[model samples]
Target: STRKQNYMMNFSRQHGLRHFYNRRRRSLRRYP
Candidate 1:
């Protein structure tokens, strides 16, 4: 359990999936 806890605690994608959301938000942010 200790090993698994450490893995989960530090595990992460720093880049994450924000790029897709960012692009989508940018598109919608502009006035049509």
Candidate 2:
């Protein structure tokens, strides 16, 4: 159970990073 929770948290972090990259790409395309 604890291990699964940890994996879920890491997966959430991965999702956050993906979102950040997506936003950064969008901004770059808009400005440059």
Candidate 3:
């Protein structure tokens, strides 16, 4: 549990959540 929390923090530190799924020009191709 402790390590899992640390991993999540690291991901958010790089702002990966936003950039991973969002691109303005290219755009996110989400499924229907």
Candidate 4:
């Protein structure tokens, strides 16, 4: 469907960033 339902589609999904999400858990700044 080329028709856009929502006026503003989320940029994240628009860019198709399926593998661009990664958090720095216990790596850069860790607290224990």
Model 3: residues with Cα > 4 Å off, grouped in runs: 16-32
lDDT (Cα, tens digit) per residue for candidate 4, span 1-32: 33363424555465555433322343446544
Residue 23 CA displacement from its true place in model 2, Å: 0.4
What is the lDDT, from 0 to 100, of the residue 29 in candidate 2? 88
Candidate topping TM-score = 2
Candidate 3 residue lDDT tens string, 1-32 = 59988898887866875665466424546443
Q: What overall lDDT goes with each candidate model?
A: 0.64, 0.91, 0.66, 0.44
TM values, all candidates: 0.40, 0.67, 0.40, 0.21
lDDT of 2 by residue, 1-32 (tens): 59999999999989999999999999988855
Model 3, residue 17: distance off in Å is 11
- Rank by lDDT, descending? 2, 3, 1, 4
Off by over 4 Å in 4: 1-9, 17-32
Is 3 or 4 the stronger prediction by lDDT?
A: 3
Give the CA lDDT, 0 to 100, for residue 10 in model 4: 57
- Models, CA RMSD each: 5.6, 3.0, 5.1, 5.5
Q: Per-residue lDDT for 21 in model 3?
A: 49
